[PDB]
Design an enzyme around this catalytic site. Structure first.
Site, mmCIF file in Angstrom:
data_model
loop_
_atom_site.group_PDB
_atom_site.id
_atom_site.type_symbol
_atom_site.label_atom_id
_atom_site.label_comp_id
_atom_site.label_asym_id
_atom_site.label_seq_id
_atom_site.Cartn_x
_atom_site.Cartn_y
_atom_site.Cartn_z
ATOM 1 N N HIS A 86 48.273 29.856 47.359
ATOM 2 C CA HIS A 86 47.173 30.694 47.010
ATOM 3 C C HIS A 86 46.357 31.141 48.203
ATOM 4 O O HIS A 86 45.747 32.225 48.257
ATOM 5 C CB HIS A 86 46.201 29.923 46.073
ATOM 6 C CG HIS A 86 46.955 29.304 44.921
ATOM 7 N ND1 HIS A 86 47.516 30.123 43.959
ATOM 8 C CD2 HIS A 86 47.176 27.978 44.581
ATOM 9 C CE1 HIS A 86 48.158 29.371 43.100
ATOM 10 N NE2 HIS A 86 47.910 28.083 43.460
ATOM 11 N N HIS B 116 38.652 27.972 53.888
ATOM 12 C CA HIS B 116 39.769 28.852 53.577
ATOM 13 C C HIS B 116 39.207 30.253 53.526
ATOM 14 O O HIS B 116 37.971 30.422 53.590
ATOM 15 C CB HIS B 116 40.597 28.594 52.291
ATOM 16 C CG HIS B 116 39.637 28.503 51.169
ATOM 17 N ND1 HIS B 116 39.029 27.330 50.747
ATOM 18 C CD2 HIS B 116 39.162 29.573 50.387
ATOM 19 C CE1 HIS B 116 38.268 27.744 49.771
ATOM 20 N NE2 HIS B 116 38.293 29.076 49.527
ATOM 21 N N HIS C 15 39.819 34.400 51.757
ATOM 22 C CA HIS C 15 40.221 35.345 50.685
ATOM 23 C C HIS C 15 40.330 36.672 51.468
ATOM 24 O O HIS C 15 39.325 36.896 52.174
ATOM 25 C CB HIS C 15 39.331 35.508 49.540
ATOM 26 C CG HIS C 15 39.179 34.171 48.830
ATOM 27 N ND1 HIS C 15 39.943 33.831 47.771
ATOM 28 C CD2 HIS C 15 38.284 33.180 49.141
ATOM 29 C CE1 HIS C 15 39.458 32.670 47.431
ATOM 30 N NE2 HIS C 15 38.507 32.232 48.214
ATOM 31 N N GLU D 167 35.020 38.296 47.901
ATOM 32 C CA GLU D 167 34.776 37.832 46.531
ATOM 33 C C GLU D 167 33.500 38.367 46.079
ATOM 34 O O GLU D 167 33.322 39.067 45.058
ATOM 35 C CB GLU D 167 34.875 36.293 46.469
ATOM 36 C CG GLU D 167 36.413 35.949 46.679
ATOM 37 C CD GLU D 167 36.826 34.736 45.893
ATOM 38 O OE1 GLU D 167 36.348 33.612 45.997
ATOM 39 O OE2 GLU D 167 37.826 35.159 45.164
ATOM 40 N N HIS E 102 35.147 30.621 53.113
ATOM 41 C CA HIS E 102 34.464 29.621 52.307
ATOM 42 C C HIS E 102 34.601 28.268 52.986
ATOM 43 O O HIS E 102 35.755 27.787 53.237
ATOM 44 C CB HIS E 102 35.000 29.553 50.881
ATOM 45 C CG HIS E 102 34.725 30.772 50.097
ATOM 46 N ND1 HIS E 102 35.488 31.119 49.025
ATOM 47 C CD2 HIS E 102 33.785 31.744 50.253
ATOM 48 C CE1 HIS E 102 35.058 32.262 48.487
ATOM 49 N NE2 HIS E 102 33.979 32.656 49.245
ATOM 50 N N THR F 272 35.934 29.994 42.770
ATOM 51 C CA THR F 272 36.460 31.303 42.362
ATOM 52 C C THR F 272 37.908 31.343 42.002
ATOM 53 O O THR F 272 38.360 32.488 41.808
ATOM 54 C CB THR F 272 36.068 32.319 43.470
ATOM 55 O OG1 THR F 272 36.739 31.844 44.585
ATOM 56 C CG2 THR F 272 34.554 32.399 43.700
HETATM 57 ZN ZN LIG Z 1 37.297 30.408 48.161
#
Ligand SMILES: [Zn+2]
Ligand SMILES: [Hg+2]
EC number: 4.2.1.1
Length: 255
Positions: free
Chosen positions: A60, A90, A92, A102, A115, A194
């Site tokens: 992911h 990590h 996104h 996000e 994050h 999230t």
């Molecule tokens: Zn995250």
């Protein structure tokens, strides 16, 4: 669950009913409706003693794990009560520079979002923290495409080695201080993780000032794979969830 048409965010509710909860993240930060709260203290980031351990591709995203067996890297102050220990960080990101984050600011989307996850150390371990409404604190940092970020290159360079799902690599002596913006001004609200399990245990602290990264740095993020080795190649792009309903929550600003 994933981020595709058949197992994407729009489908998470089926397996994770909380998907439709009251304190879901991320959300749109409306800068004009956000409430300046004078009672909000300055953030305290103490990461001089951080111990990075490894990097792993979990299908992911890629996670940098830290040793959280002692108060080595902690977050306190701001809207928080007590100490929170860094466990992992990590990102996104999008398939293009116009998307990836996000949270959005006045509906504006950034190329990525970092994050920094921390858990409240009165709960003893991360697993217990996720059972509390004030169990977790995530530091959210926006990334915009511009000049390279020197402190981000060691991460970029090891990506090649964790190309597919399940791979990991030793990743020690990495200093997270290298990822922070100049300013610690932030917005804060009660939300959630999230990605599934979407637990509503998070105190969000989204920093106002984005860090800039080069196009070539963000390009390597996009070379990663959602798939495991020996499987049809699916590029790891757009691993972000769309904004959720604020639903009566109030977003506060420290500035
Ligand atoms: Zn995250
Ligand atoms: Hg919770």
């Amino acid at each position: 669950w994933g981020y595709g048409k058949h197992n994407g965010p729009e489908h998470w509710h089926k397996d994770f009913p909380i998907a439709k909860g009251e304190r879901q993240s991320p959300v749109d930060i409306d800068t004009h409706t956000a409430k300046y709260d004078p009672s909000l203290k300055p953030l305290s980031v103490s990461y001089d003693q951080a111990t990075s351990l490894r990097i792993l591709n979990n299908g992911h995203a890629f996670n940098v794990e830290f040793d959280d067996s002692q108060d080595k890297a902690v977050l306190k102050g701001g809207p928080l009560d007590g100490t929170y220990r860094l466990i992992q960080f990590h990102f996104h990101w999008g398939s293009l520079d116009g998307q990836g984050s996000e949270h959005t600011v006045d509906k504006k989307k950034y190329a990525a979002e970092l994050h920094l996850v921390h858990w409240n150390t009165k709960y003893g371990d991360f697993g217990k923290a996720v059972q509390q409404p004030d169990g977790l604190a995530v530091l959210g940092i926006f990334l915009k495409v511009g000049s390279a970020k020197p402190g981000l290159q060691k991460v970029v360079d090891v990506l090649d080695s964790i190309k597919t799902k399940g791979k990991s690599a030793d990743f020690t002596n990495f200093d997270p201080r290298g990822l922070l913006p100049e300013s610690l001004d932030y917005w804060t609200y009660p939300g959630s993780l999230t990605s599934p399990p979407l637990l509503e245990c998070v105190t969000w602290i989204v920093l106002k000032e984005p860090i800039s990264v080069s196009s070539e740095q963000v390009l390597k993020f996009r070379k990663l794979n959602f798939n495991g080795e020996g499987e049809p190649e699916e590029l790891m792009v757009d691993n972000w969830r769309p904004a959720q309903p604020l639903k009566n929550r109030q977003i506060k600003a420290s500035f």
